[PDB]
């Protein structure tokens with residue numbers, strides 16, 4: 490698309506979202522998201538294509554932000570969290586001798602740390618899978634919260650060398666349309682991230 | 695590069711790891727290494743296809759081959775893929791049919807375009823997990839792999855047809871011979887292409 494890119498303090502940011510349901514009025518003020526589709530395969534295919542188009546066009550983003558909703562039985566409902574680490578729960582190679590969650594012939598740990606921490610936002614570990622998690626298990630999930638996209642976004646970003654930052658509001662898992670609150674709290678978090686970008690969020694030392 | 699030309703039609707062979715690729719296959723083609731699992735496959739193939747599209751070029755067919763598990767079909771035999779489903783997809787709690795991706799218009803089971811004479815056919819299920827023992831019971835497809843559905847969506851995104859091929863490694867009530875049988879299947883497929891299968 491390339492018209493969906495937002496420039497903040499000389500840096501180019503790309504926001505990606507799964508479905509239009511999560512995209513509300515408050516977020517609409519901040520940016521225009523690339524619609525990434527639903528699930529790990531849709532997310533991986535769509536984002537890898539977009540990033541490949543942008544790279545060969547020299548149009549590459551400095552930061553990709555994956556944001557949307559998530560479920561949790563652990564975390565307070567209707568609160569926004571930044572993703573500290575992500576894992577892929579659909580991946581089990583254990584019958585052949587691999588630790589659960591680890592992908593063969595790929596040097597990555599089972600839990601992949603995301604590079605960034607923005608002040609003023611809670612952190613949470615995330616699990617990505619093609620299933621919507623409900624009721625029990627849950628207790629089969631080690632991560633704090635669950636989504637269908639982020640890990641697929643990560644592998645796409647790592648493939649082209651762009652860093653990734655996640656943001657997730659909790660829409661369910663205590664037992665929906667609460668997205669109105671999710672959209673407002675997510676916009677508040679986005680404001681803090683863009684400020685952090687201006688403050689040098691992308692930089693070593 | 696890794697693409698093979700047959701009768702003026704361009705074929706791209708993709709596999710997960712070294713694995714199922716032996717001497718008999720080596721003589722026929724040099725496969726793209728697509729990685730293991732639906733996420734690795736989708737990212738790597740979408741990237742490769744995007745590089746090939748803007749440089750197009752582009753393939754007229756993508757051949758996804760490698761091993762598969764089955765609790766149903768005989769071991770050490772090769773099957774072309776009649777259809778493919780994504781077993782990790784469950785949207786049912788919010789009302790979608792189990793195995794169906796929201797906002798995509800596709801059935802839970804997606805038929806593949808081509809059938810080649812002289813080769814057994816089977817349905818395929820893909821997911822990030824290795825299916826073993828008791829886990830086979832809830833799987834409706836004849837056999838299971840970790841890649842092909844990801845390949846399918848990657849191919850569909852750029853508008854290229856896909857052909858699956860699978861040897862049975864495990865489950866399989868009663869990797870050496872599989873390499874020989876996949877090679878025999880590939881040969882029949884290439885001949886099939888020379889006969890106008892890609893019309």
Ligand SMILES: Nc1ncnc2[nH]cnc12
Pocket residue numbers: 558559560561620621622623635636637660661662
């Ligand atoms: N329960 C859930 N499981 C997976 N992804 C989700 N996104 C929002 N709620 C979810």
Ligand SMILES: Nc1ncnc2[nH]cnc12
Pocket residue numbers: 761762763764823824825826838839840863864865
């Ligand atoms: N048993 C198995 N389960 C899943 N994918 C496979 N690919 C080959 N064998 C497999």
